[PDB]
Write a protein that binds this ligand. Structure first.
Ligand code: NA
Ligand code: NA
Ligand SMILES: [Zn+2]
Ligand SMILES: [Zn+2]
Ligand SMILES: [Zn+2]
Ligand SMILES: [Zn+2]
Lengths: 227, 227
């Protein structure tokens, strides 16, 4: 890792992919690490999720420019929560183009939040100067609109919050979750990206495809015992 | 370190940059060392901060002309306090051009002090006959208008009074400080100039990037202890 600041560190996964961790103290939850990705191709960058606010977003974007020598032109949020679009306000003024699940866009509009401008209902390939970022909506999970982003040339999947890290033992915040569709969505995620070398969750350390089974055990054990 | 007078000493940091220490007895504070920098390129010089009064500023300008064989043409103050612009009246009758944060100019007019002529709002590169002097405003700290000056070709950062030296243990004069912004401004300075070799504070010895972490520690411990 490389600590760019007091609350943000970055890890390179591949020559074009970096994963960041942004830390924020949130009342009722504590010190929460929120993860995103930085994808770079030919001096252009895509941000997958923003840190919780514009301030941390602006610091992260300034680092990509100055230390990674790329300009952020594209953004995709995993779902409508703050650890995904908390800093979208800052990117929109800057002219960054955003793509997201039409369900995320409808939720943001309803709630008074910044709204991504390009929507998709099932899948969409976004090109970062030829490098493909493949966005899929495979069903509900941690949030009803949560998506995944597959980077076929790198074999990296950003699973987002529908996946729990290996140190996590609880289902967590399920106030916008579709608990009954969650296990099914994970099974579709498992069948569709068997070759992922790295799988990055919404919070916690990245890992490999075991994070999918690990999450499925947590969701299923909870469904079994609360039922 | 070489004394050019009983109360002024100079240290050469590179073939183009010198930092000076000017000592003055300030009633109620005692014998205070105030630092500034002299940057020279092709017989032209820029002064970053002046001594506390006109007589010491004159002694220093004479030394640059007679020993450095350079003409002082440019001036940039770190903020509006006397240890930054105390000798500006002398420089202005001499035709030196001044560049400063627009907030410093606004404060100078309001406080009946000499007023710099060129203002900038977020950043400005002043070219000293070809050599760039990069000025930035990254938020409030010791003063609400304090800036930093970055010399990319020498990897030297003049941080000014928003930084405390390594022998300093107290937050000092916070009468015009923005204590809540200070720790965040420091993280921004740190993130932007990771290649800084020398870091010069407004008072005390210069050192490296540890001055930034040490000042952030002093500020954070004061906020924590006084809430
Ligand atoms: Na995130
Ligand atoms: Na000074
Ligand atoms: Zn969420
Ligand atoms: Zn989350
Ligand atoms: Zn001051
Ligand atoms: Zn000072």
């Amino acid at each position: 890792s490389v600590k760019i600041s007091d609350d943000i560190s970055i890890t390179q996964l591949s020559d074009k992919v970096y994963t960041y961790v942004s830390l924020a103290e949130i009342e009722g939850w504590g010190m929460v690490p929120s993860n995103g990705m930085i994808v770079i191709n030919n001096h252009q960058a895509a941000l997958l999720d923003t840190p919780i606010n514009d301030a941390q977003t602006e610091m992260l974007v300034n680092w990509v420019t100055d230390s990674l020598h790329a300009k952020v032109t594209t953004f995709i949020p995993n779902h409508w929560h703050g650890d995904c679009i908390g800093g979208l306000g800052y990117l929109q003024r800057k002219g960054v183009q955003s793509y997201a699940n039409q369900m995320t866009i409808d939720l943001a509009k309803e709630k008074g939040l910044p709204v991504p401008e390009h929507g998709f209902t099932d899948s969409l390939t976004v090109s970062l100067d030829g490098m493909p970022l493949q966005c899929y909506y495979l069903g509900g999970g941690h949030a009803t609109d949560n998506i995944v982003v597959w980077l076929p040339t790198e074999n990296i999947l950003f699973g987002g919050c529908m996946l729990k890290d290996n140190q996590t033992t609880s289902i967590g915040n399920i106030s916008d979750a579709d608990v009954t569709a969650w296990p099914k969505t994970l099974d579709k995620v498992k069948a569709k990206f068997p070759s992922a070398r790295y799988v990055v969750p919404g919070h916690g350390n990245y890992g490999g495809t075991e994070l999918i089974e690990h999450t499925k055990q947590i969701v299923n054990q909870y469904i079994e015992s609360t039922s």
